[PDB]
Assembly symmetry: C2
Homo-oligomer: 139 residues x 2
């Protein structure tokens, strides 16, 4: 038969990494590719083809949670799962209306600052000379 | 203000990759983490804080689509966004009931074969001596 019309869900996929290596895809892109499911929607009219393929990434911990409880001024041990899984000794204090934390440990100049402005929560995470700024909106 | 109580949806995330490198997070982990948004639920009771942060994947990163329109026997230009981002000249012919394609370009023996067997779509992708065999079920 020649009629390839339909919606097709991938059922089996073998030597997908061998083929991608032959095309020089890097290790990381392959590791993301083999975690994708594929749907193919084929519209065929004689010898005219419309082939639409959808790759969906499926990562475990698609909804990962990280919980930290602390009191201002009370040093606590933090295990930075969700990031680098290191042990730091963390201490949170107020500097004005800015919540400031120092994470003493292997990394020097590691810590963060958290504050409110308007309807938004600002967070800046520091490690050495690298600052990451994140902004959150109130729901 | 000091009141950080609320549910906070991430709106922006700047130099997150720079920060993760400073923490020695590996490249592939960084590449996936930068695709995530997070919701932060802060329950603040004086100077005691419970911070539950949830990481989920963005929505535009939930799936990539790759669209190909072609007519049997009419060479067409393909840019393989979903794989190796190369330019090939593609030509599809029938060989029996098998839709056979040759992708002329940098890679030798690059092409694919598609055919129906039962209610199943078979796809074999070749590059050199590497063959990827895929089977699709009709949805």
């Amino acid at each position: 038969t020649r009629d390839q019309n339909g919606t097709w869900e991938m059922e089996s996929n073998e030597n997908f990494e061998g083929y991608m290596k032959a095309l020089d895809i890097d290790f990381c892109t392959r590791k993301i590719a083999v975690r994708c499911t594929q749907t193919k929607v084929i519209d065929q009219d004689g010898d005219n083809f419309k082939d639409k393929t959808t790759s969906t990434f499926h990562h475990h911990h698609h909804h990962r949670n990280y919980d930290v409880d602390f009191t201002v001024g009370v040093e606590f041990d933090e295990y930075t799962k969700s990031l680098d899984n290191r042990h730091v000794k963390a201490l949170v204090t107020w500097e004005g209306d800015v919540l400031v934390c120092v994470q003493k440990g292997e990394k020097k100049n590691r810590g963060w600052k958290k504050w409110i402005e308007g309807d938004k929560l600002y967070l800046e995470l520091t490690c050495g000379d690298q600052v990451c700024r994140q902004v959150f909106k109130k729901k």
